[PDB]
Design a binder for these strands. Structure first.
Ligand SMILES: [Mg+2]
Ligand SMILES: [Mg+2]
Ligand SMILES: [Mg+2]
Ligand SMILES: [Mg+2]
Ligand SMILES: [Mg+2]
Ligand SMILES: [Mg+2]
Ligand SMILES: [Mg+2]
Ligand SMILES: [Mg+2]
Ligand SMILES: [Mg+2]
Ligand SMILES: [Mg+2]
Ligand SMILES: [Mg+2]
Ligand SMILES: [Mg+2]
Ligand SMILES: [Mg+2]
Ligand SMILES: [Mg+2]
Ligand SMILES: [Mg+2]
Ligand SMILES: [Mg+2]
Ligand SMILES: [Mg+2]
Ligand SMILES: [Zn+2]
Lengths: 78, 48, 162, 137, 119
RNA sequence: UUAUUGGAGGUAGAGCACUGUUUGGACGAUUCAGACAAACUCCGAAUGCCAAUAAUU
RNA sequence: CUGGGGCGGUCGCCUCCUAAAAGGUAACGGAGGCGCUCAAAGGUUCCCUCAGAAUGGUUCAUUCAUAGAGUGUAAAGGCAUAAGGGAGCUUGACUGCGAGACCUACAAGUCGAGCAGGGUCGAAAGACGGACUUAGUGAUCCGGUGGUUCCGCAUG
RNA sequence: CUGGUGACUAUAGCAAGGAGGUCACACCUGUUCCCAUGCCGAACACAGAAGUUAAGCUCCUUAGCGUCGAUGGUAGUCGAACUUACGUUCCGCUAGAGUAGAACGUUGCCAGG
């Protein structure tokens, strides 16, 4: 006969876009995601589609928050 | 929702503000205050 | 009310002695009741239920709605405390309960200190003498006492025909 | 036994058969067991035939535990069809058996009777087996 | 069986909700209120370094006369403004401590706002 | 390219805490014991990947 | 397109698995969904907390109950800062933009601090350029309509 | 020592027992005012102080549940050699489960005493 399957959507290239310890400029996307898999930390914003972005120039730090949650911050380079 | 609408100002001849509504839900001409560039203030834009 | 006075003076010492306590706060002090007038009717009927409940309590009731259809007002209840609590309990025990049958049960404890006593017809209470039909309007008393047996003495001290 | 009453997905990737037995490597309900020393799929028909052999020889009286269940469905295409055009339909149900897995356990009969019954059952199975007792120090 | 709520725990959960998006800096410190059945306490805090740069209260002997708790809250607000002006504090953010902005907390805030502070 | 350091992520394995599947007891759904899973996870590697500042290139 | 072709099925978009712990990754591989909807189901401030079980009553009450409920809709990822529930006011479901970044053959698509103009809600800090997030769409040419300090074939 | 307010992956929580209220916190007594319940001063808010530790709350002793958790070994696996065996061998890395064990919180300021 025939298959009823065969469909899929375009992959959305989610995940980390900058490395921990890397210097980024303001507006740089740090993380693409659905929901808050990683939370916005210090000097980091959360866009309408849950994109995390740096609000300042600085160094990216991925850190833990609480017991089972994560966050990413950006800190001004001294 | 159901149909596109255009809201018109009482001074501006522009119809910049298009939006939608449900005809069964809101059969009456909907109106709301919107910012008007040519007057530089909020005025009353009403459905055409 | 006189019931509050008798609780403060009469029932307090007798209850303290019967169930030995070290302080008067361990003494049972019935928290409240709930005049739940449930009307399982779709529609007209709920207005009569609201009017009857407002008659037998003196305060407006809250129209309750189902949780599963949804948003249809099903139940109705009124909450009383303090003076309204004691006055209504006195009226229900001295007039309404003898006007129906002989009295409330002695096994209908929720297992914790809550005594569910559900009147079988709206004609028992001394109001709305006139009249639509009987209604399963349940009166559930809540109390501070942690045990079920620490509450029969309190209801009897207020005059419950156990 | 025979088969699950229901499964979420009736068309499943076939299980991996390399490696050793993950669990169920000890006699835990009875006195004696049949331990697999060789890897294979085991079908529900093979299980049922082995069970009938063992319980018939034991003449009831004893207790029989079947430790493996055919959770996995497998599919088969119709006879004489070209490749492609989707996956086939469920043909049967199988369990994966790797060395060390106890297949059957028995209790309530003598050691000699258990040995004979388990040998008879093992001749119905697609794996090499060894008679094992309940493990102590 | 009627267990009773603990008001402090409920208001503390409300305080956590309030403080998720409210913190004191050096330029803008957080003015925090703690309220009891009798006394109202205030503190001015820098959240980044976890330090307190001012403190006034209703139980302090400076203003503990016979007055309403709202008047005492007003006195606490004025005193906190005094301490803030004695430490160079100019503009702040008010943390209502999870309580409603009404009554004693609101009077403390009005007194602080009407005696020098900026929030 | 390597060393070191930091990080993102859920595969192998394992496990049954959730979803589903399953065996034998016990008590009157819960409980004891024991299993199964690409679209299960209380867990979780090796590697690979992204970077930061020394050696070789 | 096609394990020859035909017949059957399919053709764009969204979600999951296959996918080998970044991203990406095929088959007429395994499963589903979309071509909307909502004047609140948007914004803001304040408040609130579920499903279920047991036990009592001719819907109510108590007790547990980390969520086993709900989240307009398929799935996944999130959510008790609630993103879930209610109420008051309201229209930011704004105008001009936009450092930088993601994605990417192109055309497209995505996120965005922040600046200015005028507001809404809030005591205030502040939040708001629609909706928990990710589908709900179609280029150019041509034509219709509205506006327009533009052009308009000697000049008006 | 108590309280206010932060920080930290519950080693911090739950559970069971006991000890205390001088101030403090709380329960509590009320509803005139501000405010308030789809109903109720239960809550929110406001006056307070009759009283009470009874509960919350502090303090103490328990590892009962929960949480944390080695070493040793096993699985898996980067690389290499052999090999086609539902594989073997060497090397590095090294789980999960379980075991001993940790744990009935540590600490920054501010104030009181
Ligand atoms: Mg995809
Ligand atoms: Mg959006
Ligand atoms: Mg096991
Ligand atoms: Mg596996
Ligand atoms: Mg089972
Ligand atoms: Mg099984
Ligand atoms: Mg898995
Ligand atoms: Mg063909
Ligand atoms: Mg065709
Ligand atoms: Mg990979
Ligand atoms: Mg990937
Ligand atoms: Mg489809
Ligand atoms: Mg369609
Ligand atoms: Mg909500
Ligand atoms: Mg919203
Ligand atoms: Mg001409
Ligand atoms: Mg001309
Ligand atoms: Zn206009």
């Amino acid at each position: 006969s025939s298959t009823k399957n065969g469909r899929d959507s375009e992959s959305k290239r989610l995940g980390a876009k900058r490395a921990d310890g890397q210097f980024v400029t303001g507006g740089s996307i740090l993380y693409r995601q659905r929901g808050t898999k990683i939370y916005p930390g210090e000097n980091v914003g959360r866009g309408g589609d849950d994109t995390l972005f740096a609000k300042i120039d600085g160094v990216v730090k991925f850190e833990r928050k609480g017991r089972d949650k994560k966050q990413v911050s950006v800190y001004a380079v001294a | 929702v159901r149909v596109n609408v255009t809201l018109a100002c009482t001074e501006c001849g522009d119809r910049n503000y298009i939006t939608t509504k449900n005809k069964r839900n809101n059969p009456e001409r909907i109106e709301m205050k919107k910012y008007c560039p040519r007057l530089n203030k909020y005025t009353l834009h009403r459905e055409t | 009310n006189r019931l509050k006075e008798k609780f403060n003076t009469e029932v307090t010492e007798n209850l303290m002695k019967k169930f030995n306590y070290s302080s008067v706060m361990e003494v049972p002090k019935i928290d409240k009741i709930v005049v739940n007038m449930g009307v399982g009717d779709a529609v007209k009927v709920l207005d009569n239920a609201v009017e009857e409940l407002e008659l037998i309590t003196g305060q407006k009731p809250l129209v309750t709605k189902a949780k599963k259809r949804e948003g249809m007002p099903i139940g109705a209840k009124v909450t009383l405390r303090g003076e309204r609590m004691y006055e209504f309990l006195d009226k229900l025990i001295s007039v309404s309960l003898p006007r129906v049958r002989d009295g409330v049960s002695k096994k209908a404890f929720d297992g914790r200190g809550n005594y569910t006593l559900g009147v079988k017809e709206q004609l028992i209470f001394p109001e709305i003498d006139y009249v639509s039909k009987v209604r399963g309007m349940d009166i559930v008393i809540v109390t501070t006492a942690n045990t079920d047996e620490e509450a029969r003495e309190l209801l009897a001290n207020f005059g419950m025909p156990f | 036994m025979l088969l699950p009453k229901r499964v979420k997905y009736r068309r499943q990737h076939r299980p991996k058969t390399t490696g050793r037995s993950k669990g169920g490597n000890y006699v835990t309900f009875g006195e004696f067991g049949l331990q697999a020393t060789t890897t294979s799929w085991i079908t529900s028909r093979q299980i049922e035939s082995a069970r009938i052999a063992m319980t018939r020889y034991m003449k009831r009286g004893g207790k029989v535990w079947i430790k493996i269940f055919p959770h996995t469905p497998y599919t088969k295409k119709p006879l004489e069809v070209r490749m492609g055009a989707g996956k086939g339909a469920v043909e049967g149900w199988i369990a994966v058996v790797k060395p060390g897995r106890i297949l059957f356990e028995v209790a309530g009969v003598s050691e000699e009777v258990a040995r004979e019954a388990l040998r008879l059952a093992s001749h119905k199975l697609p794996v090499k087996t060894k008679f094992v007792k309940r493990e102590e120090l | 069986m009627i267990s009773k709520i603990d008001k402090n725990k409920v208001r503390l959960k409300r305080h956590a909700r309030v403080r998720t998006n409210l913190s004191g800096t050096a330029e803008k410190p957080r003015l925090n209120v703690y309220r009891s059945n009798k006394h109202i306490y205030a503190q001015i805090i820098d959240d980044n370094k976890g330090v307190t740069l001012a403190q006034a209260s209703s139980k302090d002997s400076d203003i503990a006369t016979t007055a309403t708790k709202v008047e005492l809250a007003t006195k606490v607000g004025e005193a906190i403004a005094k301490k803030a002006a004695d430490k160079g504090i100019k503009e702040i953010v008010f943390d209502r401590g999870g309580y409603l902005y009404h009554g004693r907390v609101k009077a403390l805030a009005e007194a602080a706002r009407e005696s020098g502070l900026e929030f």
